[PDB]
Amino acid sequence: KAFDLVVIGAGSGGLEAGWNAATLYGKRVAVVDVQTSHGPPFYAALGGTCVNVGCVPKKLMVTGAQYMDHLRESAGFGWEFDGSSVKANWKKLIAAKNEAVLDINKSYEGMFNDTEGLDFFLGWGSLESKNVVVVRETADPKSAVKERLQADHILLATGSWPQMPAIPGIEHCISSNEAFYLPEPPRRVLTVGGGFISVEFAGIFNAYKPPGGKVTLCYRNNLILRGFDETIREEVTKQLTANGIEIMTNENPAKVSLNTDGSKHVTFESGKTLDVDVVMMAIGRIPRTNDLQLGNVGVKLTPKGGVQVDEFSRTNVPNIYAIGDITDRLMLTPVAINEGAALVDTVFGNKPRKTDHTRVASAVFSIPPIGTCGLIEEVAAKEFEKVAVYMSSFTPLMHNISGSKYKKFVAKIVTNHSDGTVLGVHLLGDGAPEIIQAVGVCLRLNAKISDFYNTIGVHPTSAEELCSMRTPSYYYVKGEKMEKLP
Amino acid sequence: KAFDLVVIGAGSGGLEAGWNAATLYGKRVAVVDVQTSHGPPFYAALGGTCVNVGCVPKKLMVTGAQYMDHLRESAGFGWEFDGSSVKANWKKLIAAKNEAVLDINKSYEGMFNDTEGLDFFLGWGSLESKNVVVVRETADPKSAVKERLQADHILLATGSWPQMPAIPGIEHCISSNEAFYLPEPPRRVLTVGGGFISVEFAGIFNAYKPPGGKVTLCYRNNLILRGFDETIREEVTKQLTANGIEIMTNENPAKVSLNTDGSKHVTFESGKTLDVDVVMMAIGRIPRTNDLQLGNVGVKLTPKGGVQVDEFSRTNVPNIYAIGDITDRLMLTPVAINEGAALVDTVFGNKPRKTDHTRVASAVFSIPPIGTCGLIEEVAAKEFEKVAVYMSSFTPLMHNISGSKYKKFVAKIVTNHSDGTVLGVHLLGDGAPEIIQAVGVCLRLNAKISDFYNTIGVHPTSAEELCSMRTPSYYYVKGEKME
Numbered sequence: 004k005a006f007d008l009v010v011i012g013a014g015s016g017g018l019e020a021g022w023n024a025a026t027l028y029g030k031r032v033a034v035v036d037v038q039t040s041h042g043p044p045f046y047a048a049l050g051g052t053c054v055n056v057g058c059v060p061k062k063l064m065v066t067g068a069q070y071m072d073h074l075r076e077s078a079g080f081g082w083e084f085d086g087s088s089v090k091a092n093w094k095k096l097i098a099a100k101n102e103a104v105l106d107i108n109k110s111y112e113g114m115f116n117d118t119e120g121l122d123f124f125l126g127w128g129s130l131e132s133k134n135v136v137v138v139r140e141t142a143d144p145k146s147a148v149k150e151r152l153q154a155d156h157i158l159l160a161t162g163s164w165p166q167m168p169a170i171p172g173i174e175h176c177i178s179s180n181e182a183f184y185l186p187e188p189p190r191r192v193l194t195v196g197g198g199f200i201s202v203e204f205a206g207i208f209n210a211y212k213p214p215g216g217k218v219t220l221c222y223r224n225n226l227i228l229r230g231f232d233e234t235i236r237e238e239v240t241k242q243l244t245a246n247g248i249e250i251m252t253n254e255n256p257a258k259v260s261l262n263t264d265g266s267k268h269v270t271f272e273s274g275k276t277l278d279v280d281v282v283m284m285a286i287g288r289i290p291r292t293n294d295l296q297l298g299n300v301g302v303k304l305t306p307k308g309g310v311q312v313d314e315f316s317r318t319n320v321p322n323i324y325a326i327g328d329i330t331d332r333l334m335l336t337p338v339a340i341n342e343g344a345a346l347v348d349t350v351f352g353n354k355p356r357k358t359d360h361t362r363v364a365s366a367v368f369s370i371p372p373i374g375t376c377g378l379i380e381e382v383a384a385k386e387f388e389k390v391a392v393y394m395s396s397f398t399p400l401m402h403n404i405s406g407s408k409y410k411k412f413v414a415k416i417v418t419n420h421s422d423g424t425v426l427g428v429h430l431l432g433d434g435a436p437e438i439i440q441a442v443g444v445c446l447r448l449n450a451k452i453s454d455f456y457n458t459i460g461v462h463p464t465s466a467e468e469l470c471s472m473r474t475p476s477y478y479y480v481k482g483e484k485m486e487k488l489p
Numbered sequence: 490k491a492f493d494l495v496v497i498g499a500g501s502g503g504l505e506a507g508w509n510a511a512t513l514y515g516k517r518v519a520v521v522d523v524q525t526s527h528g529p530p531f532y533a534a535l536g537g538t539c540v541n542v543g544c545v546p547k548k549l550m551v552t553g554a555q556y557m558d559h560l561r562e563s564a565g566f567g568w569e570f571d572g573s574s575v576k577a578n579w580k581k582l583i584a585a586k587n588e589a590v591l592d593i594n595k596s597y598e599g600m601f602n603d604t605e606g607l608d609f610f611l612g613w614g615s616l617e618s619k620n621v622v623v624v625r626e627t628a629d630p631k632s633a634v635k636e637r638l639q640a641d642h643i644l645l646a647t648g649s650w651p652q653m654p655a656i657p658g659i660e661h662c663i664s665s666n667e668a669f670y671l672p673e674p675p676r677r678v679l680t681v682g683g684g685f686i687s688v689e690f691a692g693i694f695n696a697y698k699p700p701g702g703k704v705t706l707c708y709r710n711n712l713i714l715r716g717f718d719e720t721i722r723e724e725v726t727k728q729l730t731a732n733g734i735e736i737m738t739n740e741n742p743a744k745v746s747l748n749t750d751g752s753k754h755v756t757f758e759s760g761k762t763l764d765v766d767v768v769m770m771a772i773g774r775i776p777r778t779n780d781l782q783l784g785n786v787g788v789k790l791t792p793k794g795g796v797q798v799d800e801f802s803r804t805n806v807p808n809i810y811a812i813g814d815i816t817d818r819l820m821l822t823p824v825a826i827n828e829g830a831a832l833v834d835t836v837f838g839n840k841p842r843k844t845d846h847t848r849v850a851s852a853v854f855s856i857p858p859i860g861t862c863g864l865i866e867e868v869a870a871k872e873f874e875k876v877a878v879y880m881s882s883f884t885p886l887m888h889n890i891s892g893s894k895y896k897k898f899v900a901k902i903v904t905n906h907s908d909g910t911v912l913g914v915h916l917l918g919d920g921a922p923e924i925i926q927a928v929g930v931c932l933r934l935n936a937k938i939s940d941f942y943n944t945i946g947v948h949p950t951s952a953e954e955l956c957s958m959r960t961p962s963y964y965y966v967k968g969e970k971m972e
C-alpha cells in the first residue's frame with residue numbers, strides 16, 4: 004500500500020510517467036483509473052481519453068470516411084465500378100474500431116501485469132491527505148474505500164470531459180463520447196462547435212450518412228477553427244462545403260425538443276430551426292478536478308478549474324504534480340506525454356527538464372487535413388516589429404485529375420523578418436499532419452527561412468513547397484499588413 | 490546569333506539555369522531541346538525527362554495504382570460495392586497523364602514566348618567550337634544546320650538515357666520511355682532491374698494489369714534497391730510480394746525471342762523461362778554525351794560517358810559547364826535544379842556556390858513508398874567509430890483493420906553515437922516521402938537524436954515515431970554490429 008509515485012488517471016500523461024518511473028528509475032508506482040477498457044459507462048479507461056474515445060478511434064474513423072473521397076477520386080485515374088452499389092457500413096466501422104481499441108486496452112493490461120513495481124488499481128482516485136490517495140467504488144466520495152495508497156509523490160492526470168451547454172433539451176444531445184458508439188449512422192446531424200472535434204466528426208458523419216443525408220456544423224462566431232491560420236480556416240470552410248457539409252456560422256442552439264418520431268427539433272438563438280437525428284455538442288472540454296476532492300489538501304485551481312502548475316508541473320502542494328488536460332492549457336496527447344516524461348526525468352532522474360509549450364506541432368484530421376507548428380501571423384505580428392509571410396496555395400495536379408479541384412493545398416511560413424527565424428508553419432492538404440512533424444524539430448533548432456529554401460526538395464511531394472519559398476508574399480510592420488516593406 | 494549563355498537541354502537543370510541567368514542576371518539566354526512536347530520519337534522534350542517521361546507522369550501513375558489498395562482496404566472500414574464491377578482503365582490513366590504533361594509542355598512554351606532575353610531553339614545542340622553551339626535537324630551531325638549560336642558561356646544539360654543490355658532480342662524490349670505510352674496495360678510484364686524505376690513500374694503494372702495478369706521483377710543481385718536501408722530493402726521486397734508481384738533476385742535475362750502469338754519468350758541466365766507481353770529494361774541510365782560532338786572542343790568525359798566537373802560544375806574547358814544527370818553525380822530533378830541555380834549564381838552573380846550532394850532527401854514511390862535522407866548505417870559504420878541505430882517497425886493500426894497486415898511501417902534514425910548527430914533517416918510506409926522533406930532541413934541544421942526525442946509528437950501520425958525514440962536498437966563500433 005506504499006509507493007514512490009501514485010498516478011490518478013491511466014491516460015496519455017499518467018502512463019508515460021508511470022512506465023518511465025518504473026522502467027528507467029526502478030521506482031514503485033500505483034496507477035488508478037475508473038475502467039479497464041473502452042466505452043460506457045465512463046468512456047475513458049486504461050490508456051486514457053486519446054486511446055479510448057479520442058485521437059486513436061477518431062483517426063481510424065476519419066480514415067474510414069476518407070474512402071468516400073478515394074472511391075470518387077479513383078475515376079479520374081481510370082478506376083471504373085458500379086457507383087450505385089457503394090454503401091458505407093457504419094456498424095462494420097464501429098466494430099473494427101472497438102476491436103482496435105480493446106486490443107490497446109489489453110496491451111496496457113499486459114504492460115502492468117509484466118512490469119515489476121507498476122500496479123493498476125480500479126476505481127475513483129481522490130486525495131485524502133498530502134501523501135495518501137484513496138480509491139473508492141464510485142465518484143461519490145461517500146462510497147466504499149477499495150484501497151488507501153501511501154505516496155512519496157502524487158500525479159494528477161485525470162484529463163478532461165465534454166462541456167454540455169445548459170440549454171433546454173441538452174439531454175437530447177450527445178458528446179463525442181456517445182458519437183463513438185452510435186448503433187446507426189445519422190441521416191441528419193448537427194455538430195455544434197467550431198473546433199477540431201466538431202470539424203473532424205462532421206467529416207466522419209458526412210462519409211457514413213445514409214442516402215438523403217445532411218451534415219450541418221454550427222459555430223457561434225464568424226469563422227471555424229479559432230487559433231489556426233486564417234487562410235486555412237477559410238479554406239477548410241470551403242473544402243468542407245464542397246464535400247456537402249453545411250457550415251452555419253454566427254448560429255448557436257437555444258434549445259432542442261424531441262419530435263414525435265424521436266428526431267431532434269433544434270431552435271437556434273437566431274430563431275432558425277433544423278430537424279436532425281443527432282445533435283453532437285463539441286463546444287469545449289473542461290478539466291476533471293471535481294472528483295479528486297482537492298479541497299481536502301488545498302491544491303490551487305485556475306479561474307477556469309485547471310490545476311495551477313509551475314513550469315515543472317508542480318502544484319502549490321509539495322510532492323503533488325499535475326500534467327495533461329487537467330492543467331487546461333494545450334489539450335493534446337503528446338503534450339501530456341512530454342510533461343510526464345519531463346516530470347519523471349526531473350524528480351526520479353535528477354535531470355530537471357521542462358516541457359516547451361511553444362512550437363508544438365499539431366493537426367486537424369479534417370478532410371483534407373491541417374498540420375501546424377508555432378505562431379499564426381496575427382499573433383507573430385503583435386510580438387515582432389517585422390513579420391514576413393511566405394505562402395504557396397494551389398490545387399495539386401493529382402486533384403485536377405481526381406475531380407476534387409476544390410482541394411487547394413496551402414503552405415504558409417511565418418518569420419521574424421529581422422533574422423529570418425521561422426515563427427510558424429501552417430499546412431492544409433493531404434499529408435499535412437505527416438509533413439509537419441519534422442517541421443517541429445526544425446523550429447526547436449531555430450530554423451530560418453533560408454534553412455528551408457537552401458534544403459533540396461524531395462520531388463514530387465507537397466512537402467517540397469516548404470523548400471521553394473524565397474520571397475515573402477506580404478509582411479506585418481508594427482502590426483500593420485502590407486504587400487511591400489517601407 | 491550571339492548569347493551570354495547557351496543551354497543544351499531544356500530540362501530540370503537547364504531551365505533553372507536559363508531562367509535564372511535571363512531573369513535574375515539580365516543575360517541573353519538561348520535554350521535548345523529536340524521536341525516541344527512529350528512522347529515519341531525522342532520522349533524527353535521541353536521541360537526535361539522528369540516532366541515528360543519521369544517524376545511527374547510516374548507519380549500520377551503510382552497514385553492511380555494506389556487505388557487498387559484503397560478499393561480493397563476500404564472494406565475493413567465498412568465500404569461495400571460490387572467488386573466484380575471493378576476495372577482499372579489504363580487508357581484513361583494514360584490520357585489523363587498525357588494531358589497533364591502536355592499542359593506543362595505548353596506552360597514552358599508560354600514561358601519562352603513571354604520572357605524577353607530567353608529564347609528556345611528546336612533541334613539537336615552540339616559543340617562546333619568552345620564559343621559556338623550548332624543546332625541541327627537530327628542527332629546525325631551531317632543533318633542540316635538550323636542555327637549557329639555564338640555563346641560567351643555554354644551549359645551542357647542533356648540529362649541521361651536508358652541503358653539497354655546488348656543481349657539477343659533487345660529489340661523486343663522497351664525502356665521506361667515506351668512504358669509511358671503502352672496503349673494497353675500488359676497482362677504479363679517483366680521489369681528488369683532492382684532500382685526505383687523497376688520497382689515503381691512493377692507497382693504501376695500490378696494495379697492496372699487485366700484479369701489473370703502477373704508482374705515479375707528480376708534483379709541480378711540478392712536484394713532489390715541497393716543504396717537504400719537494408720531493413721527497408723527486405724520489407725519492400727515482402728510488401729511487393731504480398732501484393733502479388735513475383736520478385737526474381739539472382740536472375741538476369743540472357744535473351745528474348747518472340748513466341749508465335751507475338752508475346753516475349755524470356756530466357757534467364759539461370760535457364761528459367763518466362764513468357765510476358767512486355768519486357769521493360771530499367772537497369773541503368775547513362776549520361777547523354779554522344780550527340781554533343783564534345784570531341785570538337787576537348788571537354789573531358791569519363792569512360793562511363795559523363796561530363797567531368799569540379800564542385801562548381803565547370804568542365805576542363807573555360808566557359809563550358811555541365812549540370813544534372815550528364816554529370817552522373819545524383820540523378821534527381823531537385824539536384825539538377827540546385828546545380829543549375831548554383832552554377833548561374835557562381836558565373837553570372839559572382840556569388841560562389843556549390844551544390845551539397847550529401848543529406849539529400851529522396852523517395853521511392855513504391856507501394857508503400859520510401860522516404861530517405863543521408864547515410865545508411867553500413868556507410869555510416871565505415872566513416873564513424875560509433876554509430877547508433879534507433880528503429881521502430883510495426884503494422885499501423887489502420888492496416889490491421891484494412892487487412893494489409895503486411896504493410897510494416899519502418900522508421901530508422903542513424904546517429905554518430907559520439908555526439909548524437911543524425912547521419913541518416915530511413916522511412917517505409919504511407920506518407921514517407923512527405924515525412925522526409927523537413928527531415929532534410931533537420932540534417933542541414935546538424936540535428937541530434939535529442940532534438941528529435943525532445944520535440945513534441947503530432948498524434949496520431951507515422952512521423953511521430955521519429956520523435957519518441959530515446960534508446961538505440963543496436964550499434965556499430967569500428968564497423969562491427971553489436972546488439
Ligand SMILES: Cc1cc2nc3c(=O)[nH]c(=O)nc-3n(C[C@H](O)[C@H](O)[C@H](O)COP(=O)(O)OP(=O)(O)OC[C@H]3O[C@@H](n4cnc5c(N)ncnc54)[C@H](O)[C@@H]3O)c2cc1C
Pocket residue numbers: 011012013014015016017035036037038045047048049050051052053054056057058059061126127128129160161162163179200291294295326327328329333334335336337339948949
Ligand atoms: C474526440 C477527441 C479527439 C482527440 N484527438 C486528438 C488528437 O488527434 N491528437 C491529440 O494529440 N489529442 C487529441 N485529443 C486530446 C487528447 O485525448 C488528450 O489531450 C489526452 O488524452 C490528455 O491526456 P491526459 O493524460 O491529460 O488524460 P487522459 O488521456 O484523458 O487520461 C485521463 C484518465 O483519467 C481517468 N480518471 C479521471 N478521473 C479519475 C479519477 N478520479 N480516478 C481515477 N481515474 C480517473 C479517466 O478514466 C481517463 O482514463 C482528443 C480528444 C478527444 C476527446
Ligand SMILES: Cc1cc2nc3c(=O)[nH]c(=O)nc-3n(C[C@H](O)[C@H](O)[C@H](O)COP(=O)(O)OP(=O)(O)OC[C@H]3O[C@@H](n4cnc5c(N)ncnc54)[C@H](O)[C@@H]3O)c2cc1C
Pocket residue numbers: 462463497498499500501502503521522523524531533534535536537538539540542543544545547612613614615646647648649665686777780781812813814815819820821822823825
Ligand atoms: C522514369 C523516371 C522517373 C524519375 N523519377 C524521379 C523522381 O520521382 N524524382 C526525382 O527527383 N527524379 C526523378 N527522375 C530523375 C529526373 O528525371 C532527372 O534527374 C532529371 O530530369 C535530370 O535533369 P537534367 O536537367 O539533368 O536533364 P533532363 O531533365 O533529362 O533534360 C535533358 C533534356 O535535354 C534534351 N536533349 C538531350 N540531348 C540534346 C541535344 N543534343 N540537343 C538538345 N536537347 C537535347 C532532352 O530532350 C531533355 O529534355 C526520374 C527519371 C526517370 C527516367
Ligand SMILES: CC(C)c1ccc(CN2CCC(O)CC2)cc1
Pocket residue numbers: 883884885886946948953954957
Ligand atoms: C500499433 C502498435 C504496435 C504501436 C505501439 C506503440 C508505438 C510507439 N509510438 C506510439 C505513438 C507515439 O506515442 C509514438 C510512439 C507504435 C506502435
Ligand SMILES: [Br-]
Pocket residue numbers: 710711712
Ligand atoms: Br545484394
Ligand SMILES: [Mg+2]
Pocket residue numbers: 114115116117118119120121122123
Ligand atoms: Mg505490474
Ligand SMILES: [Mg+2]
Pocket residue numbers: 600601602603604605606607608609
Ligand atoms: Mg523569350
